[PDB]
Design a protein around this motif. Structure first.
Motif, short mmCIF file in Angstrom:
data_model
loop_
_atom_site.label_atom_id
_atom_site.label_comp_id
_atom_site.label_asym_id
_atom_site.label_seq_id
_atom_site.Cartn_x
_atom_site.Cartn_y
_atom_site.Cartn_z
N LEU A 76 -8.28 -8.54 -1.23
CA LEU A 76 -7.38 -9.36 -0.56
C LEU A 76 -6.57 -8.72 0.31
CD1 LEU A 76 -4.55 -10.78 -2.87
CD2 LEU A 76 -4.26 -10.08 -0.46
N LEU A 77 -6.38 -9.41 1.43
CA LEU A 77 -5.70 -8.75 2.36
C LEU A 77 -4.28 -9.78 2.56
CD1 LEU A 77 -8.24 -8.27 5.17
CD2 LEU A 77 -8.06 -7.53 3.13
N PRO A 78 -3.30 -8.93 1.96
CA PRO A 78 -1.92 -9.67 1.49
C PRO A 78 -1.47 -9.93 3.25
CG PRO A 78 -1.68 -7.69 0.67
CD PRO A 78 -3.38 -7.92 1.12
N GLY A 79 -0.87 -11.17 3.53
CA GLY A 79 -0.40 -11.50 4.79
C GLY A 79 -1.69 -11.82 5.72
N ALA A 80 -2.86 -11.74 5.43
CA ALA A 80 -3.81 -12.21 6.33
C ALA A 80 -3.79 -13.67 6.31
CB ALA A 80 -5.25 -11.70 5.76
N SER A 110 1.48 -15.17 -11.94
CA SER A 110 0.99 -13.91 -11.29
C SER A 110 -0.17 -14.16 -10.27
CB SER A 110 0.69 -12.50 -12.24
OG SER A 110 1.67 -12.43 -13.04
N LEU A 111 -1.19 -15.06 -10.74
CA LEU A 111 -2.21 -15.26 -10.00
C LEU A 111 -1.78 -16.12 -8.69
CD1 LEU A 111 -5.29 -15.16 -9.04
CD2 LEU A 111 -5.78 -17.00 -10.75
N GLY A 113 1.10 -15.83 -7.35
CA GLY A 113 1.84 -15.24 -6.32
C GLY A 113 0.99 -14.66 -5.21
N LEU A 114 -0.14 -14.17 -5.90
CA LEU A 114 -1.12 -13.53 -5.12
C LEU A 114 -1.77 -14.38 -4.20
CD1 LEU A 114 -4.25 -11.55 -6.22
CD2 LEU A 114 -4.43 -13.47 -4.63
N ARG A 116 -0.26 -17.25 -3.13
CA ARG A 116 0.80 -17.29 -1.97
C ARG A 116 0.86 -16.23 -1.02
NH1 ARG A 116 4.86 -21.20 -1.89
NH2 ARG A 116 6.49 -19.33 -1.44
N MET A 117 0.53 -14.98 -1.32
CA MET A 117 0.87 -13.88 -0.54
C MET A 117 -0.50 -13.74 0.44
SD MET A 117 3.27 -12.35 -0.99
CE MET A 117 3.34 -11.21 0.18
N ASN A 119 -1.50 -16.60 1.66
CA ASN A 119 -1.58 -17.76 2.20
C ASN A 119 -2.72 -18.80 2.07
OD1 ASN A 119 0.82 -17.00 3.99
ND2 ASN A 119 -0.71 -15.62 4.80
N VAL A 127 4.32 -20.94 -8.21
CA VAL A 127 4.59 -19.52 -8.97
C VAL A 127 5.59 -20.13 -10.08
CG1 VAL A 127 5.99 -17.13 -8.78
CG2 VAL A 127 4.08 -18.00 -6.90
N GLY B 45 4.26 -11.34 8.96
CA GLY B 45 3.46 -11.22 7.69
C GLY B 45 2.50 -10.20 7.39
N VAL B 74 -3.62 -3.02 5.29
CA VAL B 74 -3.44 -2.81 3.74
C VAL B 74 -4.63 -4.01 2.96
CG1 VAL B 74 -2.03 -2.46 1.78
CG2 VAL B 74 -1.19 -2.08 3.99
N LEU B 76 -5.78 -4.92 -0.96
CA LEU B 76 -5.27 -4.97 -2.67
C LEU B 76 -6.50 -5.53 -3.06
CD1 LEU B 76 -2.84 -7.53 -4.00
CD2 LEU B 76 -4.80 -6.74 -4.90
N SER B 110 6.45 -14.43 -5.90
CA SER B 110 5.06 -14.28 -5.21
C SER B 110 4.57 -12.75 -4.95
CB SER B 110 5.16 -14.90 -3.78
OG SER B 110 5.63 -16.35 -4.05
N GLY B 113 4.06 -11.38 -8.14
CA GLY B 113 2.79 -11.51 -8.93
C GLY B 113 1.69 -10.90 -8.12
N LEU B 114 1.41 -10.62 -7.19
CA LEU B 114 0.52 -9.75 -6.66
C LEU B 114 0.59 -8.22 -6.83
CD1 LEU B 114 0.16 -8.96 -2.66
CD2 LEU B 114 0.35 -7.28 -4.33
N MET B 117 -0.96 -8.56 -10.14
CA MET B 117 -2.23 -8.71 -10.53
C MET B 117 -3.22 -7.43 -9.87
SD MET B 117 -3.13 -11.59 -11.32
CE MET B 117 -4.97 -11.40 -10.81
N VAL B 127 8.02 -11.78 -12.38
CA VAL B 127 7.73 -13.26 -11.80
C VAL B 127 8.66 -14.33 -12.16
CG1 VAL B 127 5.89 -14.81 -11.43
CG2 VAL B 127 5.13 -12.22 -11.44
#
Ligand SMILES: Nc1ncnc2c1ncn2[C@@H]1O[C@H](COP(=O)(O)OP(=O)(O)OP(=O)(O)O)[C@@H](O)[C@H]1O
Ligand SMILES: Nc1ncnc2c1ncn2[C@@H]1O[C@H](COP(=O)(O)OP(=O)(O)OP(=O)(O)O)[C@@H](O)[C@H]1O
Ligand SMILES: [Mg+2]
Ligand SMILES: [Mg+2]
Lengths: 343, 343
Positions: A76-80, A110-111, A113-114, A116-117, A119, A127, B45, B74, B76, B110, B113-114, B117, B127
């Motif tokens: 998962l690329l956060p903010g991607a 939690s899931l 939120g991931l 959401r992170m 997008n 959340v 972001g 980055v 995850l 959020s 939660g990441l 995870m 969370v």
């Protein structure tokens, strides 16, 4: 066509239920509008990309049905903003995620939120609504404050459970007592305490599952379940009655069914739920309505209550899944703009 | 030695504050116990790994200070148990994350939660506590239910704000009215409404930032702030008074300071906070105590209130950071085992 990232499985007693839900959803997904992408989470917490034709082992055997651990990992690329979900060793662009992961992390926010992170639009509560519904202690306090009736109760942690006075509890809440861990992630840990002497062992088992344990008064009355769908303008299904084995539609008044429908909706609104929930209430002789649970991750197999309740209200399984996706995209679009203001 | 993943920056008006916090934390981190790893989130972001000596542009110029967007991305791996945070083009194993990302996603549960995870221990609320504190509407209702005083208020969404009756509001809550978006992610959107005719424009600006807007009665009284630290057994700092410009320790009674300390702790417990929060209360002439805000992401620069409050209570900045890390690991260890029960 939009790509629907079905994420399912999880470290959960309900793991096999999620497997079945996934297969059911996959078969009802409207092929005009949707292509699936499958991400299974095994019982160790590990993510596996699968092909639709090969994601299950022993698919047609309910006693043996298992996730095919393809070992095709996920990143998962956060903010991607595109290709947020990536293969570790390529994967279709996901446009909306339908998460059906049972277990603490899949259910507790939690899931969410991931997602959401990353997008990613996604089906079901966000959340807050998930975290709040999932914690039965915080949920009852929120419900209570919105002047909805919940079982009277006391909440202990590890640091206070050692101090519990069973006599004062029986004097306050009576007998039997229902002892339960606050996190509704599992149905494990729930004891009916019939005498004073059984209490301490209930309290101690529950504390192996969560840091918080509710002790509730018994609510005498019939068990009714009501499915809710929607974001800002939620809708309630007909009622199902659970017997001492669900009956749909429940054998109760139009007007009673309507009171329960209204309370389910207000309960849903108070906790900040979105997409879907099942609300389980007690209906008292007399007929006050007490909420037991708001569940933000109902079952989605064809035998599950939540979709049966909708079927019984004129909403087909295919049509239900489609509407859950549209709701996920509407929420996502609305949130985009708000996120968008800032700086 | 343990590796501390400092994650900072964010799409936030407070972005530069997070930059400064990061530099301060970096310089106080106890070198016997900790090695830092730096992950900066730019204003779009986007995540960037940086070296400690090179993570800032114009570091010594507060008007120009900016994140060095190293373009070192980055990844995850959800459900990974080791090397959960990975370079897209290697990165030290992170053992604990200290997240200081200001903005909606960094604060609202959020990001938390990441981190959950990814199975990373992390500093600050989990969370639920973050989601709940961050939503000022849900927080006031939770506070209210725990019999703590909060400003009286009404909450509108888009779907109900169109229906707002200013006369009934003034009749109920008086004048001035404080209008604010529910998500405390920004201080943007907050108007003091002095006459009836200013109300509609306040309501409409606030609704560009969140889907929910609180309209509160004015609380007449002095502004006091109190820092809280801890998981199960929280501790409260001495008080700081904000002037109509913070004064530490506040000019109030030992006994008043003690009442505020106790209420800050109960407020912290009610919302399910962990690690740290700043509680901002109004102290009435007369001297009832009304909670304004519980903030789960205080400032961490050397000029920030939360660490100044601790300094004034005998806890050094270095010592505060260290204790926030230990708390993150204790929580993580405890949660492990609970997660661990199941199936
Ligand atoms: N306070 C109560 N009064 C009366 N019956 C209760 C009470 N609490 C629980 N029960 C009974 O125990 C059942 C299980 O409790 P509950 O539903 O809270 O736990 P759960 O983990 O969600 O279990 P399930 O998965 O069956 O819902 C309820 O359906 C009801 O039959
Ligand atoms: N109900 C109220 N009564 C009196 N004063 C208020 C009220 N609400 C807000 N204020 C004043 O406005 C200030 C800002 O409001 P608030 O703190 O809720 O918003 P914020 O977005 O958290 O802003 P900040 O970042 O300054 O805390 C408060 O410190 C206080 O001075
Ligand atoms: Mg139930
Ligand atoms: Mg404040």
């Amino acid at each position: 066509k939009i790509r629907v990232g079905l994420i399912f499985g999880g470290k959960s007693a309900e793991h096999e239920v999620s497997l079945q839900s996934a297969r059911n959803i996959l078969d009802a997904l409207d092929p005009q509008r949707f292509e699936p992408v499958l991400i299974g989470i095994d019982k160790q917490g590990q993510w596996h990309v699968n092909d639709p034709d090969s994601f299950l082992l022993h698919a047609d055997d309910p006693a043996r049905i298992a996730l095919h651990r393809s070992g095709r990992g996920v990143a998962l690329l956060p903010g991607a903003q595109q290709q947020q979900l990536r293969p570790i060793q390529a994967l279709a662009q996901i446009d909306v995620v339908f998460p059906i992961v049972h277990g603490t992390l899949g259910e507790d926010g939690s899931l969410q939120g991931l997602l959401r992170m990353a997008n990613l639009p996604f089906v079901g509560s966000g959340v807050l609504g998930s975290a709040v519904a999932m914690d039965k202690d915080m949920a009852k306090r929120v419900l209570r404050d919105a002047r909805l009736a919940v079982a009277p109760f006391v909440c202990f942690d590890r640091h206070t459970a050692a101090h519990a006075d069973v006599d004062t509890l029986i004097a306050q809440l009576g007998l039997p007592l229902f002892v339960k861990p606050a996190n509704q992630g599992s149905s494990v840990g729930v004891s009916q305490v019939r005498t004073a002497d059984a209490f301490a062992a209930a309290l101690a088992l529950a504390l192996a599952y969560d840091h918080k344990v509710l002790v509730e008064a018994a609510v005498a009355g019939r068990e009714i379940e009501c499915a809710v769908l929607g974001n800002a303008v939620p809708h309630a299904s007909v009622c199902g009655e659970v017997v001492v084995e669900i009956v749909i539609p429940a054998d109760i008044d139009a007007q009673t069914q309507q009171r329960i429908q209204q309370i389910a909706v207000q309960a849903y609104q108070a906790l900040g739920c979105a997409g879907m929930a099942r609300v389980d209430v007690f209906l008292c002789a007399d007929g006050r309505i007490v909420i037991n649970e708001v569940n933000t991750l109902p079952g989605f197999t064809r035998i599950s209550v939540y979709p049966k309740l909708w079927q019984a209200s004129g909403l087909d399984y295919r049509g239900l899944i489609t509407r859950l996706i549209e709701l996920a995209l509407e929420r996502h679009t609305d949130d985009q703009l708000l996120r968008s203001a800032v700086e």
